[PDB]
Amino acid sequence: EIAQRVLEEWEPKTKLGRLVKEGQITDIHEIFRKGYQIKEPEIVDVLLPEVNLRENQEVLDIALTVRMTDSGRRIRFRVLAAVGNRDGYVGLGIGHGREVGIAIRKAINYAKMNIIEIKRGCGSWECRCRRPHSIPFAVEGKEGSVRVKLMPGPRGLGLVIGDVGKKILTLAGVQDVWSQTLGETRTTVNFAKAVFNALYNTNRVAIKPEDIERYGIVVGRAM
Amino acid sequence: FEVPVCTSCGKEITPREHATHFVCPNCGEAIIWRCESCRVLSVPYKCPKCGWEGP
Amino acid sequence: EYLVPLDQYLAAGVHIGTQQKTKDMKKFIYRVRQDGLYVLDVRKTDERLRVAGKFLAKFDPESILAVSVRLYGQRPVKKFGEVTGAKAIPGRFLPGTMTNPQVKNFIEPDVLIVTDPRADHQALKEAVEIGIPIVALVDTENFLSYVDIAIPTNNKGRKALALIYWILAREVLYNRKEIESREDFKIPVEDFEMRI
Amino acid sequence: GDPKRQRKKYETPSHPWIKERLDRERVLKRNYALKNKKELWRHETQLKEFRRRARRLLAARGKQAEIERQQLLQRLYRLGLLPADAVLD
Amino acid sequence: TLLDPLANALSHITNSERVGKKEVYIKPASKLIGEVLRVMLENGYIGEFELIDDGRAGIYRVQLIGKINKAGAIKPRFPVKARDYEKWEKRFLPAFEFGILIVSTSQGVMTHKEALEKGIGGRLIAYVY
RNA sequence: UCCUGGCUGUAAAGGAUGCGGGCUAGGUGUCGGGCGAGCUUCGAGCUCGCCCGGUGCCGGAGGGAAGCCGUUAAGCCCGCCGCC
RNA sequence: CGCUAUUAUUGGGCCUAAAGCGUCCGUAGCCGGGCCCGUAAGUCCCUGGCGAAAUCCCACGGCUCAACCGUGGGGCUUGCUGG
Ligand SMILES: [Zn+2]
Ligand SMILES: [Zn+2]
Ligand SMILES: [Zn+2]
């Protein structure tokens, strides 16, 4: 139904859009680990239809910024938004706007275009299951003054982290994690970007064939 | 599914890295993969079959 | 042995470098003159031209892009395009042709050929962002950063640039099997040079 | 030194006024007809003790660890929370 | 001045890994460095190391395969009992069986897994992951 | 304020950056020594290149709140002292 | 007490935000290049004698369950000592 509904009224402008409209590329994993540029949010609307439901579109922050022209001062809105399916795909965006609606829509489109793919597993000394309910190993991210360290935890231990990270990890599909932070967490933008980069850096650790079985590692969607 | 691996070093390619890939110019049978860091730092590469040994 | 006699190579001046150098180019230098000028080796040029010929022939002609901000390399690019089918951009390379689909001449190619990776630093960046291989003509003072195939040659002189692009077009055709063999490429090298 | 006094068998929450937690607990209280939050909290505490014991015992070496694993599983069986072919996870 | 050559060997390996080298040279050699490299090869973290005889104190040539994230020396060399390895695992490594603590024992140099199999302790000298 | 012989022990006494060792692209200048090539008015002379050690400018990866630093680190490791 | 990585072994900082003595020599202490032989003080394993009971964790049993009490298994006493 809605698949073709959206596909019909979309006229592509890029080669990736054209391939996704035709049907050469059918799965979401086919666009990622090649140096493709992603300039249309319709690609992601079509391949990941879960990122249009309101349940998957957290608005994280609204800020009121000021510019001086006295002259009189001019008021603007900055919006920070996250989107994602709860099975391995999350993105984050910022939007300028003169009105909050404009800001929000721009932020969500930039979030769709800034989409990544993560890994999941179990690497805690206290569960040793082989199911993907957490992260498989410990990772570190940074932005500005904020430093985030994410550690694997056991089942039933729900997201021991600040709220911004709670939302981002929920959307990425993580259920259990321990955290250490350093710096100024009250800058929501930088706290969020640090968590996002920590999740991205799950793909920069080198592993071996046995680690996959040992930790139940999963790249993207499960099952 | 599978995850590709750089040919100069041996590290997995990340999702939104500025990496590239192409077919060995001399042979035509293999696919050379190159990661962002190796490209910006000019790390040399050597084809597995022939050994043409380019940048 | 050679795609064109050593006499012709040295007449054009493909082997003349500059008073500067770099560690990335140490493979490709042969000798420093007494006046402090560096000289390249033409055998590696010949080899890399053959290899690049094969590589480009393995592509589709309408997705190939050549560029030359430098003035003594515009007509060679133009004629390379006319012959192979490859798109050409001699003048300026408006920023955004590869990253902004609201411009008028917006395209996304599958391979890019650069005349000088310093003068052509805009298109290089955009190509890096879109994720395609890069062939480049490199001199001594150049770095091999974000360059996937490098041809050593003088990238300053009209005669040298004309000769190089002529050779490269002929190799593309030979490897695409549109000329049963060389000697059947009756276009003069004068037609590639820049008039006065 | 000092002698030990008797201590509570329930733990209170870290923040009192969080909306998600309040909603969850309101639903539970209403549906199981509990009189206070103390009861809910003491059952939560029971569960947390079981979990902590399992976490401690999981990947441990020695004779007493094995004995205590078997004791924990027998107790959960006898209480009606796990079957017999149950593992510690 | 020069105080510890093992630490230097391992820091050199880490930095050359980070920027993508293939062969690395370690100028003051030692038998501890030999044994640590032997353990690393057995566990698959390097390839084909060899020893070279200068007249002073040999050199070690090592080949890399892009498998090391971090390698380092453990200073001070803490003493550890057979029943107290998990604390240090948690302190130095990112997951429960991921990497190796290199231990020196009266029976020789080995990993903490081998050491636990044998039921012996010793001294901590390196971690690799 | 200078000279002879003594006291005082202070400064934006500032690279506002404690000292030693190993590793992580370089380019272009300049001072001292050495080697190799060419020129030479045959000069302890001129030009080009390479090794060592000093002293500057620029800069990719990287680092940092940023200004900026960047093999003369404000990077990663091994040490010791002083201070908040 | 925690919050507080605002005392930092784990685990902080000192160009411009608080913070490198004006510079050097060197005493104690701390840190110290490579190989062979010995020793066994530190270090590791195994076994004997000690570290009162109460208090801590687990199971079972007796008070309507529970708190409490009892019967057993471990731990605690930061360690000491003979081989
Ligand atoms: Zn688990
Ligand atoms: Zn690489
Ligand atoms: Zn090949």
Side-chain angles (χ1 to χ4, degrees):
Chain A
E1 307 94 37
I2 315 307
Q4 293 79 12
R5 207 171 94 72
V6 60
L7 186 149
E8 179 53 17
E9 60 90 23
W10 170 39
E11 182 63 25
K13 299 178 184 290
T14 59
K15 45 159 54 171
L16 185 63
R18 188 167 308 117
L19 303 166
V20 170
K21 207 164 163 65
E22 297 313 317
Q24 311 197 8
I25 297 186
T26 65
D27 202 307
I28 185 60
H29 82 88
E30 288 187 327
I31 65 166
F32 268 124
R33 298 180 144 82
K34 297 184 176 187
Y36 291 166
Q37 92 180 346
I38 303 175
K39 297 283 148 150
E40 314 190 84
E42 291 83 14
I43 297 163
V44 182
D45 276 319
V46 164
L47 298 174
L48 267 168
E50 298 82 59
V51 302
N52 282 281
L53 317 161
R54 290 168 73 266
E55 187 178 1
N56 267 316
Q57 279 199 355
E58 266 288 335
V59 168
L60 304 177
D61 207 56
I62 295 139
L64 189 69
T65 56
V66 163
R67 206 172 63 96
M68 290 296 310
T69 58
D70 289 345
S71 64
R73 60 187 60 166
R74 292 297 174 268
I75 301 207
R76 172 188 263 176
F77 294 93
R78 178 184 73 183
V79 166
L80 168 86
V83 81
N85 86 327
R86 293 151 187 253
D87 193 27
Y89 293 98
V90 63
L92 194 75
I94 297 159
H96 294 56
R98 203 213 299 289
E99 299 156 359
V100 190
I102 302 177
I104 292 164
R105 296 173 222 133
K106 276 187 184 169
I108 278 170
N109 282 323
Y110 284 130
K112 283 171 186 161
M113 274 200 275
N114 293 338
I115 193 89
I116 64 163
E117 161 184 71
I118 65 147
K119 313 193 167 189
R120 287 168 301 153
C122 192
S124 180
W125 282 267
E126 278 175 318
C127 200
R128 323 217 182 192
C129 65
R130 274 102 166 99
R131 290 195 281 270
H133 62 102
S134 193
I135 48 160
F137 52 72
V139 283
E140 277 171 67
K142 62 172 173 58
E143 195 90 68
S145 84
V146 176
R147 261 51 150 181
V148 171
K149 195 193 171 80
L150 291 183
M151 274 163 300
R155 277 188 294 129
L157 184 142
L159 289 201
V160 191
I161 181 149
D163 290 15
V164 189
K166 273 188 191 106
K167 285 160 192 157
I168 293 179
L169 303 169
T170 303
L171 295 181
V174 191
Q175 283 97 42
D176 308 298
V177 78
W178 278 312
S179 177
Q180 269 152 23
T181 56
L182 304 157
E184 196 58 37
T185 56
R186 291 173 298 191
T187 63
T188 306
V189 174
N190 276 349
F191 190 13
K193 282 195 223 215
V195 178
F196 193 74
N197 294 331
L199 289 177
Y200 186 87
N201 290 335
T202 41
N203 299 294
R204 287 212 214 270
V205 179
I207 59 172
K208 307 152 158 177
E210 293 80 3
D211 307 341
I212 301 178
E213 193 269 348
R214 192 185 288 141
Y215 302 115
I217 292 171
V218 162
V219 184
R221 270 195 281 234
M223 279 161 64
Chain B
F1 48 87
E2 206 62 65
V3 176
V5 182
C6 185
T7 283
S8 309
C9 71
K11 286 184 161 184
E12 269 180 5
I13 309 279
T14 46
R16 211 72 87 96
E17 184 176 6
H18 294 318
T20 201
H21 77 295
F22 47 98
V23 192
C24 174
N26 227 28
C27 315
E29 297 286 273
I31 299 159
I32 311 292
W33 284 91
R34 289 189 94 210
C35 75
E36 184 178 343
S37 313
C38 282
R39 294 176 86 200
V40 76
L41 295 184
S42 311
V43 173
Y45 69 79
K46 188 191 180 200
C47 193
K49 306 190 74 79
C50 172
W52 168 61
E53 183 166 359
Chain C
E1 190 55 67
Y2 284 100
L3 298 156
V4 82
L6 193 85
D7 264 348
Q8 211 169 313
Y9 270 132
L10 312 161
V14 175
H15 74 308
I16 288 151
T18 47
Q19 284 157 325
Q20 288 212 28
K21 60 162 174 53
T22 301
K23 171 203 69 60
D24 265 325
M25 307 303 288
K26 205 157 172 46
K27 303 142 63 199
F28 292 132
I29 286 164
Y30 199 65
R31 181 176 66 85
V32 66
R33 279 177 174 175
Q34 279 298 134
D35 81 345
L37 194 82
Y38 292 89
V39 182
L40 295 146
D41 194 21
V42 195
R43 291 285 299 189
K44 303 177 172 168
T45 308
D46 195 73
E47 193 257 332
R48 298 285 171 131
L49 281 157
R50 281 152 186 285
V51 186
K54 300 185 78 194
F55 187 60
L56 299 177
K58 263 146 185 192
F59 269 104
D60 180 74
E62 306 86 340
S63 48
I64 285 163
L65 197 137
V67 185
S68 191
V69 183
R70 175 168 285 145
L71 180 62
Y72 278 166
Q74 301 185 331
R75 174 87 175 271
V77 167
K78 247 179 68 168
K79 281 288 149 71
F80 186 95
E82 290 191 352
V83 169
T84 60
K87 303 183 183 127
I89 292 170
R92 189 207 155 192
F93 203 88
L94 316 182
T97 82
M98 278 200 243
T99 69
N100 192 12
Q102 290 206 358
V103 309
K104 298 148 140 159
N105 270 313
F106 166 81
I107 55 161
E108 275 165 289
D110 279 325
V111 69
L112 187 130
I113 306 151
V114 165
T115 318
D116 176 19
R118 195 211 58 98
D120 293 289
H121 72 271
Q122 199 52 59
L124 193 89
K125 288 173 192 271
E126 285 181 15
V128 168
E129 281 280 339
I130 79 159
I132 58 165
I134 291 145
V135 180
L137 307 187
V138 292
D139 215 332
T140 60
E141 56 95 20
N142 285 122
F143 294 98
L144 292 196
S145 163
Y146 281 128
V147 169
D148 298 299
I149 286 153
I151 321 181
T153 176
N154 191 48
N155 49 0
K156 264 89 174 190
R158 47 195 299 268
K159 292 240 180 184
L161 286 169
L163 180 68
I164 298 290
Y165 265 114
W166 190 80
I167 294 168
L168 179 62
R170 194 188 67 179
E171 266 281 296
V172 163
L173 298 196
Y174 184 50
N175 266 278
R176 276 177 179 162
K177 283 161 193 55
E178 286 167 5
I179 296 174
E180 200 157 9
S181 77
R182 312 178 196 74
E183 290 99 10
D184 286 305
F185 188 66
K186 266 75 156 172
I187 291 92
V189 183
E190 280 270 285
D191 171 58
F192 272 70
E193 271 169 80
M194 159 173 174
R195 301 311 201 258
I196 304 141
Chain D
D2 312 296
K4 187 187 272 282
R5 303 175 184 200
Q6 271 144 35
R7 303 297 307 273
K8 290 166 166 84
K9 301 298 215 93
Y10 58 101
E11 298 168 343
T12 60
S14 183
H15 210 286
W17 299 310
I18 305 195
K19 215 206 309 184
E20 164 78 354
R21 207 270 317 296
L22 289 182
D23 305 339
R24 287 192 272 118
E25 282 186 6
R26 202 186 280 123
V27 164
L28 299 163
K29 196 188 174 247
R30 190 169 163 85
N31 280 2
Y32 294 90
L34 315 171
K35 183 186 197 276
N36 304 309
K37 299 272 192 112
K38 285 184 226 200
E39 309 168 359
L40 184 60
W41 293 340
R42 90 194 204 207
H43 295 305
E44 263 176 11
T45 306
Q46 289 155 9
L47 171 66
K48 285 183 210 145
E49 298 292 356
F50 293 135
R51 296 188 70 256
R52 280 163 206 166
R53 278 169 66 190
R55 295 208 271 126
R56 188 170 70 244
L57 284 165
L58 201 151
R61 291 175 175 264
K63 186 188 287 290
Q64 213 65 34
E66 178 65 29
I67 298 173
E68 286 192 8
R69 282 172 205 132
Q70 299 310 72
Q71 285 179 353
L72 174 56
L73 293 170
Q74 282 156 28
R75 174 91 181 141
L76 293 167
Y77 184 66
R78 207 193 165 183
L79 269 163
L81 300 159
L82 292 189
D85 67 328
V87 308
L88 208 59
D89 285 328
Chain E
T1 42
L2 175 64
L3 295 174
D4 201 8
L6 178 74
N8 281 349
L10 294 170
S11 41
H12 187 17
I13 286 166
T14 49
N15 293 335
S16 277
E17 288 285 328
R18 281 172 179 163
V19 293
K21 304 318 182 94
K22 302 274 185 304
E23 69 181 12
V24 82
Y25 286 94
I26 290 154
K27 186 166 211 157
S30 310
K31 298 178 127 68
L32 277 179
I33 293 167
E35 297 301 73
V36 167
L37 296 169
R38 179 182 55 69
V39 170
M40 288 150 93
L41 180 67
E42 296 167 347
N43 288 259
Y45 279 112
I46 60 166
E48 268 176 11
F49 64 96
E50 64 150 7
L51 185 54
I52 296 151
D53 176 280
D54 55 16
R56 304 153 168 214
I59 293 146
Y60 264 118
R61 174 176 173 272
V62 184
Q63 309 282 326
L64 314 168
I65 52 153
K67 291 288 171 200
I68 290 152
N69 295 287
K70 220 194 175 185
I74 296 168
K75 293 307 303 301
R77 304 178 164 172
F78 297 104
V80 61
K81 289 162 152 103
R83 57 149 78 77
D84 278 353
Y85 280 118
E86 204 196 10
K87 169 183 185 295
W88 301 104
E89 283 189 67
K90 288 172 154 96
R91 171 138 151 198
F92 284 112
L93 301 173
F96 62 79
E97 273 144 27
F98 189 94
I100 45 164
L101 303 173
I102 303 196
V103 186
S104 193
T105 63
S106 66
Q107 284 171 44
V109 171
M110 72 182 77
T111 72
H112 75 290
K113 309 190 168 92
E114 310 184 66
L116 204 45
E117 295 177 25
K118 299 186 187 220
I120 61 182
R123 299 246 173 203
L124 303 169
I125 65 180
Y127 71 95
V128 192
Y129 86 84

